[PDB]
C-alpha cells in the first residue's frame, strides 16, 4: 500500500522533469511564496513541519533559508532518501496522515508541498486539518497544494490521451488515468520499467512494476468548510505558488490559511 | 536498410486489430468492400491483384476471401513469413523494397497498398513506385492506396515539441514518440516496445526492450494529383478511410484511387 516504494529511487529525477515539463513549481519558488506569505503574517515563523515530506526536497529548501524543519511521511522508501539528503540531525517521522505524532506548542507553520494531500480522502483530510490545528498556535499557518481544475481537465478528459508515457534516464513510465463511475476518487496507474540487475541470455532486461496512485479531488467549497470547522480563517487559494488567483486553468491550487484563537 | 517491422512482426496483427477496435482504422473487410465496389464501377474486370507492402497478409487474406487472385510484396522477411503462414504455399509472396517490383507486365488487373506502407516512401521513392505500378497495369486497371491524412498529422504531431503516447496490450507495452524534425520532409514515430523475456531475472519476470524508428513522409493532395498525372494515371480521387465520405481536414487515412491511362510508361 505504498505507491512510492517503487518510485523513491527515481522520484527526484521525475520531480525535476515535472518542473521542466508539467509546470510544477521548483521548491525554491515554493520557498519564495512561503517566505512572502509568512512575512505578511504577524506571528514569526522559525519551526516548520512538512507533512508528506517525501525525499525532502522542500525540507532542504526551507532549511537553507534558516528554518528549523521536521518532516513526516508514510513511506519508508521516501524517508530513506530524505535521511540521506538531510543528515542525521533532522527529525523525520514515519506516520500516515491523519496521524501526526508530535506535540503542540512546537511548530510555527505546517506545509505540504507537491501534492501529498491529493492522496487523502475527505474524511482523512478533515482529520488532518484537525491534527494540524492542534499543532499550530494562534496566528500560525497551514499551506498546501492540491490538483486544480486545469489538472482534471487536462489529464482526466475530454480530448486528452488517457495513456501517457515518459522515457527518462533508462527508466520508462506509462501512466493511465481512469475515473471510476460514481467514485469520489480518480486513479492514476504507474507502470514502470526499470533496468534489471542482470541480463537475460545476451540482452539487457527490465523489471516491470505497477502502482496505483489514488487521488481525491478536493473542491474549493470543501476546503473552505474544513478550514472553518477546524479553527482556521483567512483561507485563500492561489495559482501554483504565485500571486495569481486560482482559476479554470490552474493545474495546482495553493491554499493558505491562518489558525484562529479557538480551541 | 533497417527493417522497423522486424521487432514488430510478432505482435503486429494484435496491434492492427487494436487500431481497428480502438483507433478508427478501417476493418480489412471495409477495405475489401470499397475495392470491390470501386472495381465493379470500372469497365475492365479485376481478377489478379498485387498488394504492395502486404505485411502479414491481412489484406491478402481478405481479398482471397472475396475470390481475387492475390500476390503480395513486402521488404520485411519477418512480416512475409507471417503472410506465408496466413496464406499457405499457393500465394506468391515477393520480398522486395519499393520502388523495386520484380513482376511481369501484363500480370495484374489492380494494385493496392492498404494500411499505410506508402507512408514510408520518400517523394522520390513514391514517384518511382508510381512509375513501376503504371508499368504493371494495363489501360483501365487501377491503383488504390492509403496514406496518412491531414487529421493524422494534426492529432499526433506537434510542431513545437515531441508528443508521447503509449499502449499496454496483452503483456506487450509500446511507447510511441512523435517528432517533426526541423526542415525535414518526414516526421518520425519511434516505437519503444517491451516484450516478455525468455527467462526470469531472479524471482521477477523480465522484459526485453527494442526501439525502432518509423519514418513517415507526408503526401499532400496536390502531390498525389501531380504524381498521378506524371505516371500515366487519371481520375485520381480521395475518400476518407475506405468509406464513401470525402477526404477532409479531420481524415486520419486518405484513400486514393486512380485509373491507368493508355500512355506508355
Ligand atoms: N496519508 C499519507 N500520510 C503520509 N504521507 C503520505 C500520505 N499520502 C501520501 N503521502 C506521501 O506524500 C508524498 C507526496 S510526494 C511530495 C514530496 C515532497 N513534499 C516534495 O516537495 O517533493 C509521498 O512521499 C507519499 O508517501
Ligand atoms: N519501401 C518499402 N518496400 C516494401 N515494403 C515496405 C516498404 N516500406 C514499408 N514497407 C512495408 O509496409 C508494411 C506496412 S504494414 C501494412 C500491412 C498490410 N498491408 C495490412 O493491411 O495490414 C510493412 O510490412 C513494411 O515492411
Ligand atoms: Cl510554472
Amino acid at each position: 500500500p505504498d505507491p512510492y516504494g517503487n518510485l523513491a529511487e527515481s522520484y527526484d529525477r521525475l520531480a525535476q522533469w515535472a518542473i521542466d515539463q508539467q509546470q510544477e513549481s521548483p521548491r525554491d519558488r515554493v520557498g519564495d511564496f512561503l517566505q512572502t506569505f509568512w512575512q505578511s503574517q504577524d506571528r514569526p515563523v522559525r519551526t516548520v513541519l512538512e507533512i508528506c515530506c517525501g525525499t525532502g526536497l522542500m525540507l532542504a529548501e526551507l532549511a537553507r533559508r534558516g528554518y528549523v524543519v521536521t518532516g513526516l511521511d508514510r513511506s519508508a522508501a521516501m524517508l530513506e532518501q530524505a535521511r540521506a539528503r538531510m543528515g542525521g540531525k533532522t527529525t523525520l517521522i514515519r506516520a500516515e496522515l491523519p496521524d501526526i505524532p508530535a506535540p503542540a506548542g512546537e511548530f510555527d507553520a505546517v506545509v505540504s508541498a507537491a501534492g501529498g494531500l491529493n492522496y487523502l480522502s475527505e474524511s482523512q483530510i478533515s482529520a488532518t486539518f484537525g491534527a494540524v490545528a492542534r499543532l499550530l498556535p494562534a496566528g500560525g499557518t497551514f499551506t498546501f497544494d492540491v490538483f486544480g481544475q486545469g489538472f482534471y481537465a487536462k489529464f482526466f478528459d475530454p480530448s486528452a490521451p488517457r495513456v501517457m508515457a515518459l522515457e527518462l534516464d533508462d527508466i520508462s513510465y506509462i501512466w493511465t488515468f481512469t475515473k471510476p463511475a460514481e467514485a469520489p476518487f480518480v486513479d492514476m496507474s504507474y507502470t514502470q520499467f526499470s533496468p534489471a540487475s542482470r541480463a537475460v541470455d545476451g540482452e539487457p532486461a527490465f523489471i516491470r512494476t505497477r502502482d496505483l496512485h489514488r487521488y481525491y479531488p478536493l473542491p474549493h467549497a470543501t476546503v473552505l468548510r474544513l478550514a472553518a470547522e477546524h479553527g482556521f480563517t483567512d483561507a485563500r487559494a492561489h495559482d501554483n505558488y504565485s500571486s495569481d488567483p486560482s482559476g479554470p486553468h490552474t493545474l495546482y491550487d495553493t491554499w493558505t490559511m491562518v489558525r484562529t484563537g479557538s480551541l
Side-chain angles (χ1 to χ4, degrees), chain A residues 117-156 158-161 163-181 183-197 199-200 202-233:
Chain A
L117 301 189
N118 292 304
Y119 292 88
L120 280 59
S121 72
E122 182 173 342
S123 60
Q124 294 161 343
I125 204 172
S126 178
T128 295
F129 271 57
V132 172
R134 290 192 292 273
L135 290 169
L136 287 171
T141 64
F142 182 28
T143 305
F144 63 89
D145 62 88
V146 287
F147 295 133
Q149 177 177 336
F151 182 90
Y152 291 111
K154 175 194 293 280
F155 299 110
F156 294 91
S159 176
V163 182
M164 291 182 50
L166 168 64
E167 306 175 81
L168 183 66
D169 296 346
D170 222 23
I171 302 178
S172 302
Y173 309 87
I174 299 177
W175 297 299
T176 306
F177 303 78
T178 62
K179 291 187 48 53
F185 55 82
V186 299
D187 281 348
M188 181 179 180
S189 301
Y190 277 53
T191 292
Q192 184 173 317
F193 287 97
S194 303
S197 55
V200 172
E203 267 284 330
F206 295 79
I207 301 306
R208 185 181 65 189
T209 57
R210 293 182 171 167
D211 289 280
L212 174 60
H213 295 241
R214 175 158 293 177
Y215 297 133
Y216 296 87
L218 187 58
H220 286 206
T222 301
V223 177
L224 294 174
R225 186 197 88 243
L226 292 175
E229 288 170 341
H230 296 91
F232 295 99
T233 192

Side-chain angles (χ1 to χ4, degrees), chain A residues 23-25 29 240:
Chain A
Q23 299 178 243
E24 295 203 1
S25 285
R29 176 206 294 178
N240 194 19

